[PDB]
Design a protein around this ligand. Structure first.
Ligand SMILES: *[C@@H]1O[C@H](CO)[C@@H](O[C@@H]2O[C@H](CO)[C@@H](O[C@@H]3O[C@H](CO[C@H]4O[C@H](CO[C@H]5O[C@H](CO)[C@@H](O)[C@H](O)[C@@H]5O[C@H]5O[C@H](CO)[C@@H](O)[C@H](O)[C@@H]5O)[C@@H](O)[C@H](O[C@H]5O[C@H](CO)[C@@H](O)[C@H](O)[C@@H]5O)[C@@H]4O)[C@@H](O)[C@H](O[C@H]4O[C@H](CO)[C@@H](O)[C@H](O)[C@@H]4O[C@H]4O[C@H](CO)[C@@H](O)[C@H](O)[C@@H]4O[C@H]4O[C@H](CO)[C@@H](O)[C@H](O)[C@@H]4O)[C@@H]3O)[C@H](O)[C@H]2NC(C)=O)[C@H](O)[C@H]1NC(C)=O
Ligand SMILES: *[C@@H]1O[C@H](CO)[C@@H](O[C@@H]2O[C@H](CO)[C@@H](O[C@@H]3O[C@H](CO[C@H]4O[C@H](CO)[C@@H](O)[C@H](O)[C@@H]4O)[C@@H](O)[C@H](O[C@H]4O[C@H](CO)[C@@H](O)[C@H](O)[C@@H]4O)[C@@H]3O)[C@H](O)[C@H]2NC(C)=O)[C@H](O)[C@H]1NC(C)=O
Ligand SMILES: *[C@@H]1O[C@H](CO)[C@@H](O[C@@H]2O[C@H](CO)[C@@H](O[C@@H]3O[C@H](CO[C@H]4O[C@H](CO)[C@@H](O)[C@H](O)[C@@H]4O)[C@@H](O)[C@H](O[C@H]4O[C@H](CO)[C@@H](O)[C@H](O)[C@@H]4O)[C@@H]3O)[C@H](O)[C@H]2NC(C)=O)[C@H](O)[C@H]1NC(C)=O
Ligand SMILES: *[C@@H]1O[C@H](CO)[C@@H](O[C@@H]2O[C@H](CO)[C@@H](O[C@@H]3O[C@H](CO[C@H]4O[C@H](CO)[C@@H](O)[C@H](O)[C@@H]4O)[C@@H](O)[C@H](O)[C@@H]3O)[C@H](O)[C@H]2NC(C)=O)[C@H](O)[C@H]1NC(C)=O
Ligand SMILES: *[C@@H]1O[C@H](CO)[C@@H](O[C@@H]2O[C@H](CO)[C@@H](O)[C@H](O)[C@H]2NC(C)=O)[C@H](O)[C@H]1NC(C)=O
Ligand SMILES: *[C@@H]1O[C@H](CO)[C@@H](O[C@@H]2O[C@H](CO)[C@@H](O)[C@H](O)[C@H]2NC(C)=O)[C@H](O)[C@H]1NC(C)=O
Ligand SMILES: *[C@@H]1O[C@H](CO)[C@@H](O[C@@H]2O[C@H](CO)[C@@H](O)[C@H](O)[C@H]2NC(C)=O)[C@H](O)[C@H]1NC(C)=O
Ligand SMILES: *[C@@H]1O[C@H](CO)[C@@H](O[C@@H]2O[C@H](CO)[C@@H](O)[C@H](O)[C@H]2NC(C)=O)[C@H](O)[C@H]1NC(C)=O
Ligand SMILES: *[C@@H]1O[C@H](CO)[C@@H](O[C@@H]2O[C@H](CO)[C@@H](O)[C@H](O)[C@H]2NC(C)=O)[C@H](O)[C@H]1NC(C)=O
Ligand SMILES: *[C@@H]1O[C@H](CO)[C@@H](O[C@@H]2O[C@H](CO)[C@@H](O)[C@H](O)[C@H]2NC(C)=O)[C@H](O)[C@H]1NC(C)=O
Ligand SMILES: *[C@@H]1O[C@H](CO)[C@@H](O[C@@H]2O[C@H](CO)[C@@H](O)[C@H](O)[C@H]2NC(C)=O)[C@H](O)[C@H]1NC(C)=O
Ligand SMILES: *[C@@H]1O[C@H](CO)[C@@H](O)[C@H](O)[C@H]1NC(C)=O
Ligand SMILES: *[C@@H]1O[C@H](CO)[C@@H](O)[C@H](O)[C@H]1NC(C)=O
Ligand SMILES: *[C@@H]1O[C@H](CO)[C@@H](O)[C@H](O)[C@H]1NC(C)=O
Ligand SMILES: *[C@@H]1O[C@H](CO)[C@@H](O)[C@H](O)[C@H]1NC(C)=O
Lengths: 227, 126, 211, 304, 80
């Protein structure tokens, strides 16, 4: 079918161009409508704008003085460039395909219809935080167990900004994994703590390595875990 | 097209009072006399009293005198001027007053006691 | 956008009424939006659903004008807790740019679950890096509201502790971390450190010593 | 002085006007509002005013009298008589061969119509056309169908009527708001029935103009609103139906034609200059079913 | 709008109402007063108004016609 995936800087300084892109899968770009949506913490969903299968522009007047939704049909990629960003522009940006419906209530010739739009398939989301503070990489410190069933994990200390992705054995170990929500310390850096439940038989020895990725810092660090 | 519309049901307690309406439509309100009939299970249908909108002249039944009061309120706007609202008030309620109260009208305005038209009923539980 | 509360029981029926009633012929969209997650299209045309939505999600069609648009959830689950939006399109009002308000459905009467505290001592790499950190991991508790208290040997700490707000899990339970950043000398000069997690009724304790 | 806006939509036809209106007390005013079709108002220089103010007074129709045509029978007094004419191909003038007498005429329905005669009496046998002198172009030709063409009309908007006390017993009935959708008042005819009926009319038209000449149909050429459009009454409101879709066929040798109709409340009727009537709005959705039985044509220098 | 008081006494029945009334000139008013029995007036919320205003118009009886019942004879036409 059709699936999407966004990709953005994740951190843009105030009063700057918030560039973004979204590549769709298993579908043609020039025969569907596409909508951009952002959702801030504490605020409801906000409809950015939408582009047609004829590549027509129409933005929310709450934002139209700053948005420009482009699209390039050579691939399945369409962009989104908000500029003059402020602190209120921190939100998750979802890439959804709009589909055009024509609600007819009277005579079609007299123009007694109105057009409604519904998004059926959505993207996963890309977190974009705005702050004058620069980027910052993490630093993984392992957590060893201490002997039936035991638990082990990786401490992802001070990093900025959200988020980070945690894999175990590059993706093989996926049962019992439990990545925890981060904590914004008063110093301004998030701290995430992953943990995996493991049978006590494999403690000696089944090699366990946690994979930590933080895209705003171009880092990919790993570390072992052993008593 | 004679149609009598009453008010919703009410749950009262002994000592309180009630007020129910009966909006008629489809005939000259001041020409035909209206009545009020209560219907309790296991009892005879009791006639409370009739009211003539021409001046509001009323006649109460003896077992209800002093506790029953019937009024009217016909609209004074000649566009829909064919409708009145007969109100019924029963004070010092007892558990024996629990029934379904109807407002009736004769088949014609010459003879009043041939109740051809009935309201949907206003159940009261004391 | 502000949020409208709602409280239904597990297995009962819900009636999420739209907050912006229509003026003419309506074409309402319903979205299930879990916080910090991709929304789900429940109903796009007044009564029509997409492929992959249970029958227990029904939308009211406008055949006679007057019937307001409401979302009916029959046989609610614990996983049905999310936000719900009424995207109201009608012939009188113009272009429905904004989504609905916010109906945060909270299901009452879910199974009460006890937490699972797991306290780890500081890592040797960070102790070698001249810093210490205790990680009191809590998970699989309901309702999601816990109180964390740290004790140095036997005295309360309070200074230097950060705590997660109880986020929701996949199994509809809740989890939260609990960090205590110590100096590498303060962690060695003490005998034991405990993490008192008082969830709902009574507390659970996990202790860790420097040996 | 009316303060009007457009009723929220996207063509801005019927307006939403507010005004300082008198009350039951001669020293109190009130800021009430109402809906008026644009055909009833004109601007000053936004500010509007009722169309009839610089012309004549206006009397609101009593909402208890009926606009319905009732069969009226005309009778001659004693000593007089009415002469019928049972000739089924009798054109207007000449000597009727089969004559009978009646004390009263038949049920005459005084249906006020225009261009298209509505609810009239059909003709037996074949459709005849009249006009006193058919060759005089300035004489209205009366064509009388023999089969009825069904026409359906409606004002789809669900209207509301608001009573506004403007004095001791003076209650002006205004248009409150439109419940539900806002649509367009129109009329329907069967294109097949209208095609065969326009064929029946062009049939008898050759007996007066020639078996080879062309017969062309067009819409009105100008004048007032009451003449350029099909004007009549439907449920109690006066339509003005654009008949350009009915008269557009040059003849030589499932369907549904829809006419865009407007609505007026401030009419003078007949054509008198002196008094206009305000028709109080009809509550609910309007639709009426009528037959068009006649037609009033007007020809325009060789053989076409 | 009527501005009424009680007529000085001690039951306060007939009132003493004053009002801004029109004159012979369409641009001049006048503050005249009159007595009205309470059966003819109703309050607003002291301020009063004539009872018939929210119902119908009112015509003052000509003070030259007689309210006296005169013996009227009903007769049938010829042939009856
Ligand atoms: C005088 O002359 C006049 C001029 O001729 C004449 O005017 C006519 O007036 C009437 C009413 O006054 C008008 O009737 C309306 O018609 C509307 C349009 O209907 C057409 O389109 C729809 C939708 O078409 C899409 O979907 C179908 C499948 O559903 C596809 O097959 C189509 O290809 C199409 O999909 C493509 O096109 C879309 C563009 O719209 C694209 O977006 C899409 O991507 C695709 O590319 C069809 O369903 C209709 O088909 C019906 O009729 C055919 C005959 O051709 C029959 O086989 C069968 O009965 C079909 O059902 C038609 O083709 C209607 O929308 C409207 O009815 C709705 O609106 C009113 C008021 O708003 C509601 O009260 C009513 O209940 C209807 O609401 C239903 O539908 C909406 C929208 O779908 C829902 O939101 C709503 O919940 C409700 O759903 C319920 O009912 C459904 C069935 O109706 C059911 O499926 C649901 O599950 C639910 O129960 C109304 O009927 C007419 O258009 C005028 N004529 C013209 C030419 O404009 C007048 O009548 C004359 N007489 C007078 C004045 O007396
Ligand atoms: C023709 O034009 C007239 C105007 O002359 C229109 O009449 C007005 O219509 C508007 C709506 O379009 C009315 O405004 C609504 O008033 C409601 C009444 O509440 C008032 O009173 C309470 C006290 O009980 C106050 O607290 C409150 O502030 C109001 O003063 C409001 O409840 C409505 O609020 C809605 O809008 C707000 C803001 O968007 C929302 O937050 C609310 O949730 C709610 O949805 C609204 O303000 C106005 O009262 C009408 N005026 C009169 C005199 O009636 C006609 O509608 C128009 N007709 C047509 C056909 O176009
Ligand atoms: C219904 O209500 C109306 C009021 O709207 C009453 O009408 C008023 O009645 C009062 C008396 O109750 C009148 O007041 C009297 O006015 C007299 C006229 O003199 C005026 O003009 C001279 C100039 O020539 C001025 O110098 C003088 O000051 C006045 O302005 C006065 O002579 C009266 O004076 C009396 O009282 C004073 C004070 O108590 C005494 O010292 C005097 O000796 C004297 O006894 C008095 O002031 C008033 O004028 C009336 N108004 C109108 C518009 O007519 C109705 O009477 C009342 N009806 C009922 C049935 O209740
Ligand atoms: C041409 O002639 C037609 C028929 O002779 C006219 O149609 C009539 O139009 C009037 C008003 O537009 C209608 O009166 C309406 O009545 C309905 C209620 O009627 C329904 O209920 C009664 C039961 O009491 C039932 O007997 C009827 O059959 C209906 O089912 C209301 O909406 C209003 O009160 C309104 O007055 C007539 O009903 C209607 N007659 C028919 C046979 O359809 C048409 O108006 C004429 N055209 C012109 C231009 O004059
Ligand atoms: C109602 O809508 C119509 C149509 O948009 C408006 O007509 C416009 O009037 C202005 C006058 O200021 C003209 O400059 C425009 O050219 C008109 N537009 C069209 C499409 O004709 C009308 O003004 C609106 N009325 C109100 C009260 O808002
Ligand atoms: C419109 O159509 C026809 C005109 O012939 C009328 O319906 C017929 O009326 C005759 C005379 O009353 C009846 O004998 C037929 O049985 C009727 N046909 C049907 C199918 O009912 C109808 O009354 C006309 N309406 C008018 C003139 O208002
Ligand atoms: C037109 O609108 C009126 C109200 O503006 C509708 O009347 C309602 O009818 C229902 C019955 O289905 C009653 O329960 C309501 O009480 C009525 N409302 C009022 C205010 O009287 C009417 O149904 C509408 N009709 C159409 C065809 O839209
Ligand atoms: C005008 O309206 C009438 C009534 O709605 C239509 O007559 C109906 O026609 C359909 C289709 O043949 C029949 O199924 C119905 O039984 C008819 N109604 C009645 C009451 O007999 C008529 O077709 C319409 N004509 C036009 C030109 O719109
Ligand atoms: C009646 O309808 C016709 C078309 O059905 C209208 O004709 C328009 O006339 C104007 C010039 O007056 C042209 O510019 C348009 O192109 C015509 N429209 C069409 C579709 O041909 C006519 O205007 C209508 N009558 C009124 C009074 O508006
Ligand atoms: C006229 O006199 C009567 C009787 O004293 C007044 O009636 C009183 O009205 C007030 C209203 O403010 C009530 O609180 C009192 O209880 C009433 N008294 C009685 C005995 O009923 C009336 O207000 C007086 N009117 C004027 C204009 O002064
Ligand atoms: C005109 O106003 C009078 C005010 O007295 C209304 O009469 C009273 O109305 C209330 C409730 O509407 C009743 O409780 C009183 O019993 C009525 N009193 C009298 C003496 O009738 C009257 O209904 C209003 N008329 C209109 C048409 O609104
Ligand atoms: C009514 O009169 C007042 C007088 O101040 C004026 O301001 C207002 O605009 C008037 N209302 C209308 C609708 O013109
Ligand atoms: C009507 O018929 C007579 C004779 O049958 C004829 O003289 C007269 O011209 C006809 N009327 C018209 C308008 O042609
Ligand atoms: C008549 O038709 C012509 C041509 O379509 C159009 O320009 C004109 O506006 C029409 N007039 C009327 C009154 O419909
Ligand atoms: C007459 O009008 C004036 C206007 O200033 C007002 O002060 C006075 O109270 C009015 N008179 C009455 C009796 O209401």
């Amino acid at each position: 079918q059709v699936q999407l995936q966004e990709s953005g800087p994740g951190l843009v300084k105030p009063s700057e161009t918030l560039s973004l892109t979204c590549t769709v899968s298993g579908g043609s770009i020039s025969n569907y409508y596409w909508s951009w949506i952002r959702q801030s913490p504490g605020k409801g969903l906000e409809w950015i704008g939408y582009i047609s299968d004829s590549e027509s522009t129409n933005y929310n007047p709450s934002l139209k003085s700053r948005v420009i939704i482009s699209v390039d049909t050579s691939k399945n990629q369409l962009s989104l460039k908000l500029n003059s960003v402020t602190a209120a522009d921190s939100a998750i940006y979802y890439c959804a395909r709009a589909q055009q419906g024509k609600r007819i209530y009277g005579m079609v010739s007299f123009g007694e219809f109105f057009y409604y739009y519904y998004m059926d398939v959505w993207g996963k989301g890309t977190t974009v935080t705005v702050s004058s503070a620069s980027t910052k990489g993490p630093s993984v410190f392992p957590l060893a167990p201490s002997s039936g069933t035991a638990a082990l994990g990786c401490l992802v200390k001070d990093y900025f900004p959200e988020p980070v992705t945690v894999s175990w054995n590059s993706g093989a170990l996926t049962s019992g994994v439990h990545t925890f929500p981060a904590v914004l310390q008063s110093s301004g850096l998030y701290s995430l703590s992953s943990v995996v439940t493991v049978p006590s038989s494999s403690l000696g020895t089944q090699t366990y390595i946690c994979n930590v990725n933080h895209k705003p810092s171009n880092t990919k660090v790993d570390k072992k875990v052993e008593p | 097209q004679v149609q009598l519309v009453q008010s919703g049901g009410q749950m009262k307690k002994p000592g309180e009072s009630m007020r129910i309406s009966c909006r008629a439509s489809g005939y000259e309100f001041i020409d035909c006399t209206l009545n009020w009939i209560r219907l309790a299970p296991g009892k005879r249908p009791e006639w409370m009293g009739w009211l003539k909108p021409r001046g509001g002249a009323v006649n109460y039944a003896r077992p209800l005198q002093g506790r029953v009061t019937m009024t009217r309120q016909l609209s004074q706007d000649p566009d829909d001027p064919d409708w009145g609202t007969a109100f019924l008030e029963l004070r010092s309620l007892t558990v024996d007053d629990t029934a379904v109260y109807f407002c009736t009208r004769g088949k014609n305005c010459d003879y009043n006691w041939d109740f051809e038209h009935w309201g949907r009923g206003t159940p009261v539980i004391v | 956008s502000y949020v409208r509360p709602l409280s239904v029981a597990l297995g009962e029926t819900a009636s999420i009424s739209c907050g912006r009633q229509a003026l003419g012929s309506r074409a309402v969209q319903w979205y299930q939006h879990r916080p910090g997650q991709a929304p789900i299209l429940l109903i796009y045309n007044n009564q029509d659903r997409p492929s992959g939505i249970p029958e227990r999600f029904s939308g009211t069609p406008d055949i006679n004008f007057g019937t307001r648009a409401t979302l009916t959830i029959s046989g609610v689950e614990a996983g049905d807790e999310a936000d719900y939006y009424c995207h109201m399109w009608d012939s009188r009002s113009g272009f429905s740019w904004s989504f609905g308000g916010a109906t945060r459905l909270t299901v009452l009467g879910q199974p009460k679950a006890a937490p699972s505290v797991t306290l780890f001592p500081p890592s040797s790499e960070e102790l070698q890096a001249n810093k210490a950190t205790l990680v009191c991991l809590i998970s699989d508790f309901y309702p999601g509201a816990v109180t964390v208290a740290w004790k140095a040997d036997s005295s309360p700490v309070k200074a230097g502790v950060e705590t997660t707000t109880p986020s929701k899990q996949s199994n509809n339970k809740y989890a939260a971390s609990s960090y205590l950043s110590l100096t590498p000398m303060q962690w060695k000069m003490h005998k034991s450190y405990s993490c008192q997690v008082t969830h709902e009724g009574s507390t659970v304790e996990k202790t860790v010593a420097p040996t | 002085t009316l303060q009007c806006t457009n009723v929220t939509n996207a063509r801005g036809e019927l307006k939403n006007c507010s005004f300082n209106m008198t009350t039951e007390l001669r020293d109190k005013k009130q800021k009430v509002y109402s809906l008026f079709y644009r055909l009833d108002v004109v601007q000053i220089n936004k500010e509007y005013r009722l169309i009839n103010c610089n012309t004549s007074a206006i009397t609101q129709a009593c909402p208890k009298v009926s606009f319905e045509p009732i069969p009226i029978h005309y009778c001659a007094p004693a000593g007089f008589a009415i002469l019928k004419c049972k000739d089924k191909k009798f054109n207007g003038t000449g000597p009727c061969p089969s004559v009978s007498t009646v004390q009263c005429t038949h049920g005459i329905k005084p249906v006020v119509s225009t261009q298209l005669l509505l609810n009239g009496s059909l003709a037996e046998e074949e459709v005849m056309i009249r006009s006193e002198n058919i060759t005089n172009n300035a004489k209205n030709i009366l064509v009388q169908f023999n089969t009825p063409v069904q026409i359906n009309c409606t004002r789809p908007n669900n209207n509301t009527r608001k009573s506004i006390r403007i004095g001791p017993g003076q209650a002006f009935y205004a248009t409150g708001d439109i419940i539900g959708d806002i649509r367009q008042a129109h009329c329907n005819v069967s294109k097949a029935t209208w095609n065969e009926t326009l064929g029946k009319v062009v049939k008898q038209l050759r007996k007066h103009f020639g078996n080879n000449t062309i017969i062309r149909f067009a819409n009105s050429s100008g004048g007032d609103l009451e003449v350029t459009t099909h004007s009549f009454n439907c449920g109690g409101e006066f339509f003005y139906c654009n008949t350009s879709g009915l008269f557009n066929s040059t003849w030589i040798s499932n369907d549904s034609i829809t006419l865009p109709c407007r609505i007026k409340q401030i009419i003078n009727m007949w054509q008198r200059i002196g008094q206009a009537m305000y028709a109080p709005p009809i509550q609910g959705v309007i639709r009426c079913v009528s037959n068009i039985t006649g037609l009033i044509l007007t020809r325009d220098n060789s053989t076409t």
